[PDB]
Design a protein around this ligand. Structure first.
Ligand SMILES: Nc1nc2c(ncn2[C@@H]2O[C@H](COP(=O)(O)OP(=O)(O)OP(=O)(O)O)[C@@H](O)[C@H]2O)c(=O)[nH]1
Ligand SMILES: Nc1nc2c(ncn2[C@@H]2O[C@H](COP(=O)(O)OP(=O)(O)O)[C@@H](O)[C@H]2O)c(=O)[nH]1
Lengths: 426, 309, 429
């Protein structure tokens, strides 16, 4: 099987560097080097993310889409930056304006064809394609607009292969941009109707989880990114490993989406202990479920405790008892019968790889489909209206060839999306 | 708003035929009362059950007649023909377009609208527009204009949905409408190897917009009537339709129109304050007991009599 | 004489690798195929010095069949007999049965027609699947389906691992198991059932270990199964053919599902303790805590049991140990059934893994049976289904895979008459 990553925008891009920083080491691939793999198993399934050309050069099969040179020229001028074949860099030296409209209708719409071109060169690579990984932020141009287009096109070209989306939904407390809800509401819209698996991460849900669950005092972006990339590795790549009970994107999809919206999840990693001290090793297993299922530790902003779950997928990856795994999951399902929805006898989807995260003994990625994420699109949707009402920075959109009915559309859509999700919380 | 889910369902069983009798064919359907049909000893009640001999006239009167009045009344409505291929959907919807006896629901509707208009002609100024398009593989193609392919649904300023770029033709008379239908039928054909397969697979949608303004009263009225000949049930739109009907039947505040392009276009005419008649057609014939069961079940999604447990 | 076997679904393959292991282990055939008729009803003498496998392996993800062609045993099967569809598994019936699973079937069949020819007057195909899976539920559904027509004139005993009563895995499981039951029902001869959870209990209560790897449950069924084919197709003082089963085991055409049970489950480390009496093991068979199935005889009246014994057993010991039972009454057998006790005696005692956790006695009782008990197990699994179907839950996943409101609703009605069937054939006189 296979997949083809997609680094839309700067963020989605910045993260690319971290997702690939990791993944590679979790596959023994040095900058341009080959497979130094401490083992021999980190190779029989690599294909999922690379391509064979030389014999020591397995190149990441991702796409780097962005209308701001400097960015990709920071990712390509640093560490692992020199492993991507230049063909991968689909830049847009234009003005990468922070407008969803500027990267979806006017500026991005041009650079698109020169992207799809490659997304096809990579898809028609070899063997059988599974789906595409998509990273980006719903709070900017090259991210929400142009990346949200990249998919609307992808999903017309292969409505068969899957589409996981890793979105950095606009954090609450403080917005790292101003129109944010504009660029956001507009991209979520496109998401709820193309990709079929979305993993929403919040820069501040991370800080928290990174400053209190990792006594880490100076959580640089690199970190946040790093933590995130840690989860997306547990998801995909991982399951493309052996296991007593293994799954793969689809299983994950076909066990997690009760209703076609596409629904968004909230990823959570397992061993998340501070370096030295904490290295408690309390990782027998009840310790991992202890972790994963708590409020804090959910990369999302919202707290599960604020709304039932529809599905859950503990994708563990480290030798354990299909008994102490299958078992724990249960008590968990009974101690919290309250929030776990009922019309699904077994919400949880236990998954079990074998080999764990390179240096760790036992981990377990968590992919939750809780109704709690209602209380986020609400947020976003609110911010919109409060500012849409006055058409705040709307001239930067319309003046870029947009529509007063376009914004209406998205909000509503994504706004209805909130509605539905409640239809199950009850 | 009005009743909420003003959905009526009529089951129409196709005539028995000499060929079928010659074959010796075998027996699904038993009848009880106006409303019920029994298959495999299980009763299914509906608003009405029409046996094999029922006339086009009977179907129109029971199914369509009131809806047409509502449209003239200024309300929207939808009529569907649902069933397996060769169930009798097209016969029911169109029948023989020109034959006074043979004609189906659509011709009868057109006739009734104009006749009503001719009668009024006082201070009411009418305007009738028609659209004819099909949905295949969840894609919309204009039957009036073959160039318009893969059309997209949009909502206007006031939430009304529309098919962007879909041809809208103003029709003066019944003849004009029939010609339009004939044109659409012709246009359908081209680039199609197998019409049978194509016809069963693509939902045909005929839209009649009747607008009128009384010069004196100045009250203006507009009504849309969507006539739909669905794809064979033996499909994304069908499933979408099932979900919408069930939701309406439940009395749910939120209906799943977004699930298909068809349901999205139909949103203003289906459910809410609109009348909807679904004519499920079935063969009495032996094999597809199973398909009829499905059709009956689908009709059941809307609200009927619920049995005791 | 022989009985091919088709291990379908990762699980049916893991269990397969296991049951397949126990085999050579008690037949002196190293993983290299070579040993230094009898058992020919499960192994073809490709010449020659080797043995090979008299079965096949069907999974839509390579992962699991791949591992077989890594670990010793790698040498055992023919590179050919292990079918794969690089494509996608999908924990959904539909896709596995219809859409995807279809593409492979032909090819699959081909082997069970190519392997079915090579032999000499066979008896049937021991099928190994995991009810609630994608490749296991769906696929087989049509595999067994295409068999019942191509060889209606044989035995179709499918050995299933039906849904843990509370500890299921897949979120949809029931969708996949109400569908593998209805499609296979009108095609199997006798369906053996081994409950994944109810086997754990045995690992907790009758062997002590909270560390049971799947690799264990497999060693277990891998045992109970060895008692079915292996040893039985093997000479003895009271041989029992495969046909024998279905005949002495199914009272009615519904591909009736008996339950597998084993007697001596005791952990190594106990290995020295004085062995158990012919009477004790016999009695252990009537305990609802030792039956590889969460169908505790909560009321289910047995209606036929096939007590397969192996090892040192005196026919009188049996034709007495059973007599004592026939008169315990609290073990109430069906009415319309005077005597429903097929005593199968083999010679060679069991053969425990060199160092797993199985005691290793010199006699065992793999008793299987049809019990009005499953009236439950099916019930509890059917109900599940409704709850979700009642909301369509993951329905869009099948529809979009060449299925319809028909197949579900019409397979529900199916089992409905399986809840009435297993009710009527009992509880009444
Ligand atoms: N006893 C036993 N049960 C197993 C084993 N592996 C899986 N199972 C059970 O069988 C079911 C799992 O089926 P899956 O592995 O998800 O699927 P599959 O049937 O192989 O086919 P697919 O869904 O397409 O992957 C669960 O109920 C498991 O508890 C095994 O090795 N032994
Ligand atoms: N986790 C994370 N968030 C980022 C990174 N870079 C920008 N962001 C977030 O992305 C949003 C800004 O969008 P941006 O990526 O600049 O848009 P674009 O570059 O025009 O497509 C803010 O909410 C930031 O917190 C990053 O490297 N990691």
């Amino acid at each position: 099987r296979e997949i083809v990553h997609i680094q839309a925008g700067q963020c989605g891009n910045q993260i690319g560097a971290k997702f690939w920083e990791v993944i590679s080491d979790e596959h023994g691939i040095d900058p341009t080097g080959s497979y130094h793999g401490d083992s021999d198993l980190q190779l029989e399934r690599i294909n999922v993310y690379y391509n064979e050309a030389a014999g020591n050069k397995y190149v990441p099969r991702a796409i780097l889409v962005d209308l701001e040179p400097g960015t990709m020229d920071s990712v390509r001028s640093g560490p692992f930056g020199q492993i991507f074949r230049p063909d991968n860099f689909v830049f847009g030296q234009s003005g990468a304006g922070n407008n969803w409209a500027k990267g979806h209708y006017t500026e991005g719409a041009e650079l698109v064809d020169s992207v799809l071109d490659v997304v096809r060169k990579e898809s028609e690579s070899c063997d059988c394609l599974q789906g595409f990984q998509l990273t980006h932020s719903l709070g900017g141009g090259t991210g929400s607009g142009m990346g949200t287009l990249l998919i609307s096109k992808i999903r017309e070209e292969y409505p068969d292969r899957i589409m996981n989306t890793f979105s950095v939904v606009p954090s609450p407390k403080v917005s790292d941009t101003v129109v944010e809800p504009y660029n956001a509401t507009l991209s979520v819209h496109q998401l709820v109707e193309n990709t079929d698996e979305t993993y929403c991460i919040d820069n501040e849900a991370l800080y928290d989880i990174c400053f209190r669950t990792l006594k880490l005092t100076t959580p640089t972006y690199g970190d946040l990114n790093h933590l995130v990339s840690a989860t997306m590795s547990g998801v995909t790549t991982c399951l493309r490993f052996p296991g007593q009970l293994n799954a793969d994107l689809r299983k994950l999809a076909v066990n997690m989406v009760p209703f076609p919206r596409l629904h968004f999840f909230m990823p959570g990693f397992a061993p998340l202990t501070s370096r030295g001290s904490q290295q408690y090793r309390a990782l027998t297993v009840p310790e991992l479920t202890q972790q994963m299922f708590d409020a804090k530790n959910m990369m999302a902003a919202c707290d599960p405790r604020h709304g039932r779950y529809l599905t859950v997928a503990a994708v563990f990856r480290g030798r354990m008892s299909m008994k102490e795994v299958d078992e724990q999951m249960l008590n968990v399902q009974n101690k919290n019968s309250s929030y776990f929805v009922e019309w699904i006898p077994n919400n949880v989807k236990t998954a079990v790889c074998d080999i764990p995260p390179r240096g760790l003994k036992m981990s377990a990625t968590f992919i939750g489909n809780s109704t709690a994420i209602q209380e986020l699109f609400k947020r976003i949707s609110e911010q919109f209206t409060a500012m849409f009402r006055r058409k705040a920075f709307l001239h930067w959109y319309t003046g870029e060839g947009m529509d007063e009915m376009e914004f209406t559309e998205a909000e509503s859509n994504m706004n209805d999306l909130v509605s539905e999700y409640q239809q199950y919380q009850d | 708003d009005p009743a909420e889910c003003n959905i009526k369902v009529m089951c129409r069983f196709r005539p028995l035929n000499e060929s079928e009798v010659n074959r010796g064919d075998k027996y699904v359907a038993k009848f009880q009362g106006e409303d019920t049909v029994m298959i495999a000893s299980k009763p299914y009640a509906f608003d009405r059950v029409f046996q094999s001999s029922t006339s086009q006239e009977q179907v129109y009167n029971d199914c369509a007649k009131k809806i047409v009045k509502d449209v003239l009344e200024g309300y929207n409505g939808t009529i569907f023909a649902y069933g397996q291929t060769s169930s009798g959907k097209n016969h029911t919807m169109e029948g023989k377009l020109h034959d006074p006896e043979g004609m189906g629901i659509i011709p009868r509707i057109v006739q009734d609208i104009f006749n009503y208009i001719y009668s009024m002609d006082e201070n009411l100024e009418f305007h009738i527009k028609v659209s004819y398009f099909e949905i295949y593989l969840d894609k919309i193609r204009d039957l009036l204009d073959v160039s318009k392919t893969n059309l997209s649904v949009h909502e206007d300023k006031n939430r009304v949905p529309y098919v962007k770029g879909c041809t809208e033709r103003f029709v003066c008379s019944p003849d004009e409408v029939m010609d339009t239908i004939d044109e659409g039928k012709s246009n359908r054909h081209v680039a199609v190897t197998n019409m049978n397969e194509h016809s069963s697979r693509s939902h045909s949608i005929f839209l009649i917009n009747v607008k009128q303004e009384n010069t004196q009263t100045e009250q203006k009225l507009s009504g849309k009537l969507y006539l739909v000949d669905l794809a064979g049930s033996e499909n994304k739109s069908l499933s979408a339709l099932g979900n919408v009907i069930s939701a309406l039947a439940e009395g749910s505040t939120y209906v799943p129109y977004r699930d298909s392009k068809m349901t999205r276009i139909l949103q203003d005419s289906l459910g809410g304050n609109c009348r909807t008649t679904i004519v499920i057609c079935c063969s009495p014939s032996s094999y597809n007991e199973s398909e009829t069961k499905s059709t009956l079940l689908f009709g059941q999604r809307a609200k009927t009599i619920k049995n005791t447990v | 004489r022989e009985c091919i076997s088709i291990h379908v679904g990762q699980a049916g393959v893991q269990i397969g690798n296991a049951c397949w292991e126990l085999y050579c282990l008690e037949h002196g055939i190293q993983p290299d195929g070579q040993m230094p008729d009898s058992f020919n009803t499960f192994f073809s003498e490709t010449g020659a010095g080797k043995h090979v496998p008299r079965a096949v392996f069907v999974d839509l993800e390579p992962t699991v069949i791949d591992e077989v062609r890594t670990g010793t045993y790698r040498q055992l099967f023919h590179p050919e007999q292990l079918i794969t569809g690089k494509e996608d598994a999908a924990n959904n019936y539909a896709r596995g049965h219809y859409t995807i699973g279809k593409e492979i079937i032909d090819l699959v069949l081909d082997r069970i027609r190519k392997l079915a020819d090579q032999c000499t007057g066979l008896q049937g195909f021991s099928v190994f699947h995991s009810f609630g899976g994608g490749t296991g539920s769906g696929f087989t559904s049509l595999l067994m389906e295409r068999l019942s027509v191509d060889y209606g004139k044989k035995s179709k005993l499918e050995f299933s691992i039906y849904p843990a009563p509370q500890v299921s895995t897949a979120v949809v499981e029931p969708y996949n198991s109400i569908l593998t039951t209805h499609t296979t029902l009108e095609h199997s001869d006798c369906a053996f059932m081994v409950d994944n959870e109810a086997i754990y209990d045995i690992c907790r209560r009758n062997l002590d270990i909270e560390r049971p790897t799947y690799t264990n449950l497999n060693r277990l069924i891998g045992q109970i199964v060895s008692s079915i084919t292996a040893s039985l197709r093997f000479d003895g003082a009271l041989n029992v053919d495969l046909t024998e089963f279905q005949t002495n085991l199914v009272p009615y055409p519904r591909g009736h599902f008996p339950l597998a049970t084993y007697a001596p489950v005791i952990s190594a480390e106990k290995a020295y303790h004085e062995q158990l009496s012919v009477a004790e093991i016999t009695n252990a068979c009537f305990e609802p805590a030792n039956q590889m199935v969460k169908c505790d005889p909560r009321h289910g009246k047995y209606m036929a049991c096939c007590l397969l014994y192996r090892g040192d057993v005196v026919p009188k010991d049996v034709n007495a140990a059973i007599a004592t039972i026939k008169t315990k009454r609290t073990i109430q057998f069906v009415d319309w059934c005077p005597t429903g006790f097929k005593v199968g005696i083999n010679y060679e005692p069991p053969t425990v893994v060199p160092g797993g956790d199985l005691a290793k006695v010199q006699r065992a009782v793999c008793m299987l049976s049809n019990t009005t008990a499953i009236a439950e197990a099916w019930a509890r699994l059917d109900h599940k289904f409704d709850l979700m179907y009642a909301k369509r839950a993951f329905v869009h996943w099948y529809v979009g895979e060449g299925m319809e409101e028909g197949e579900f609703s019409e397979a529900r009605e199916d089992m409905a008459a399986l809840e009435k069937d297993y009710e009527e054939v009992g509880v009444d006189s």
